[PDB]
DNA sequence: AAAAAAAAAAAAAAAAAAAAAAAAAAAAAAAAAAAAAAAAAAAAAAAAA
DNA sequence: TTTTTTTTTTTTTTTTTTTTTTTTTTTTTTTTTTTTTTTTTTTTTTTTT
């Protein structure tokens, strides 16, 4: 009977052979060519917020020093992304986890998750991460996490940068189950070595995702057969948590449009909770169904989790002129006022753009695109001082949440 | 053409309307004025 | 050590194209009227109760 | 003096041709929004006093 479908099972293979080929072109084609975008003395002040005799007296400091400062085709001043950070680490600005004032603090867990498909948590989020990273007068240590398992955040240039070099890695899931040689522990130093991967900026970091994650959940369906206690909740958090939180200060986590036992994980183990969504009804009443799904599940997980300290969402691919849209972040603000943010992410085609070339709104300049230039500075000035705005909900509440 | 038919075979009650009846008017006028050059030339054929 | 001159830059102004809206025209009907065609009710004629 | 049949009046019904109106689709049409080239403004270095 099954001839033409040994034929046509084995030609789904004979096709993603093909399509194996497909991303041996894909890994071809991406490959940088590129460098990061200059400040040009206006732009330097805009972003890093140093005086201009401060400025001067650094990189004269420096000048004297071995490394030698770059200037354009123009003798007009022009300093790399690198050398920014360079001039940061030898500023001698410390970062709250140097800062005597705040130094011996936990992970900023932040997350975003969504429950509904295509509607922006990826590429919103790693805009929103990579534009925390530009607090440069601070050198944020950021974690950024790709728990989904498809997301491009290992891939759109902040990524895991797997080179051929790299040898061998064992995911999340394999953190999950301890499957590295049964001889060698997982200590920090493993996590440096397999797990925390950079993101071609001297300050921002990754972890990378595998499709095979989602036997993740398979595995978990069989715990459950093998187990009664849903103890696989706290998997999470002493294989990762424990053993992350003692080095890192945030952590940037996108989780996926879906809600499973991973996903489960990932929201109870962490200790603070957004909630992306876009202003559409369909969303809003997924929400819903998402806040009566809580409440009972949370009772299920352990006891000793005083629940999130503090709950907001999230608009996206918001239009701002669109009067069912505006009319539902109107009813929004009027239900869960102060836990919503105001702040707009429009939707333009600069967005595409920078997309297709996989590169992020800060990776290129106006030279490289057409004039949608105030759209992108709009876009990027939103998602900074909406940075801010949740970076300040996690300052007032350095006070509860770090004590709990 | 398609339904393997003639002008004429099918009637205005075979259904159009004012379209079709218009389409035979300008049929059989053609027909008359083609007809007509058939004596202006037949005359010629009987004599060849 | 400072001034002036020279060179690589953003902001404003001008022109064209694609979105949309209203009106008009070709058409394409379902309904009615007029004319035409196919049968019918009082009167008339001849041979005969 | 009566009866029968046929040729004229008129009456009834139907089809075809030709009457009007409405809706749908197609064509010409400026306002608003979007795109590209640009003249003015800002920054740095070298040379001279
Ligand atoms: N500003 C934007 N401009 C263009 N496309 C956007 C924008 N924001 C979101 N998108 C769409 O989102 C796609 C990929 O981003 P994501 O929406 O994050 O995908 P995702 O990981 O499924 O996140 P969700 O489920 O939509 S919240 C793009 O291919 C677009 O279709
Ligand atoms: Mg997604």
Redesign the pocket.
């Known amino acids: 009977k099954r001839e033409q479908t040994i034929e046509n099972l084995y030609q789904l293979a004979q096709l993603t052979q093909q399509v194996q080929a497909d991303r041996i072109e894909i890994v071809l084609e991406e490959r940088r060519d590129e460098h990061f975008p200059p400040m040009?003395?206006?732009l330097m002040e805009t972003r890093s917020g140093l005086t201009?005799r401060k400025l001067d007296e650094a990189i004269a400091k420096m000048e004297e020093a071995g490394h030698q400062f770059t200037?354009?085709?123009?003798?007009?001043?022009s300093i790399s992304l690198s050398e920014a950070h360079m001039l940061m680490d030898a500023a001698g600005v410390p970062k709250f986890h140097e800062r005597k004032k705040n130094n011996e603090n936990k992970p900023w867990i932040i997350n975003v998750q969504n429950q509904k498909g295509g509607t922006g948590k990826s590429m919103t989020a790693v805009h929103l991460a990579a534009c925390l990273a530009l607090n440069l007068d601070k050198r944020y240590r950021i974690c950024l996490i790709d728990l989904d398992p498809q997301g491009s955040l290992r891939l759109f240039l902040n990524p895991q940068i797997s080179l051929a070099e790299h040898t061998n890695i064992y995911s999340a899931v394999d953190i999950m189950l301890d499957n590295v040689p049964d001889g060698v522990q997982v200590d920090t130093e493993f996590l440096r070595k397999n797990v925390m991967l950079p993101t071609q900026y001297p300050n921002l970091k990754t972890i990378s995702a595998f499709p095979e994650d989602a036997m993740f959940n398979a595995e978990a369906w069989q715990y459950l057969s093998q187990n009664q206690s849903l103890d696989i909740v706290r998997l999470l958090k002493e294989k990762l948590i424990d053993k992350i939180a003692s080095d890192f200060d945030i952590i940037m986590i996108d989780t996926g449009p879906h809600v499973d036992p991973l996903v489960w994980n990932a929201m109870y183990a962490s200790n603070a909770l957004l909630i992306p969504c876009a202003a559409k009804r369909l969303d809003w009443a997924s929400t819903v169904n998402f806040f009566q799904h809580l409440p009972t599940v949370y009772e299920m997980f352990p006891e000793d989790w005083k629940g999130l300290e503090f709950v907001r969402l999230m608009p996206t691919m918001f239009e701002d002129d669109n009067k069912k849209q505006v009319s539902v972040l109107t009813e929004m603000n009027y239900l869960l006022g102060d836990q919503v943010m105001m702040a707009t992410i429009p939707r333009s085609?600069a967005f595409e753009t920078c997309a297709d070339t996989y590169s992020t709104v800060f990776d290129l300049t106006?030279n490289d695109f057409?004039?949608?230039?105030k759209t992108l500075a709009t876009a990027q000035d939103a998602v900074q001082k909406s940075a801010l705005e949740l970076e300040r909900v996690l300052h007032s509440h350095w006070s509860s949440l770090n004590q709990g």
């Open positions: 040009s003395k206006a201009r200037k354009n085709n123009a003798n007009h001043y085609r106006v057409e004039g949608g230039k």
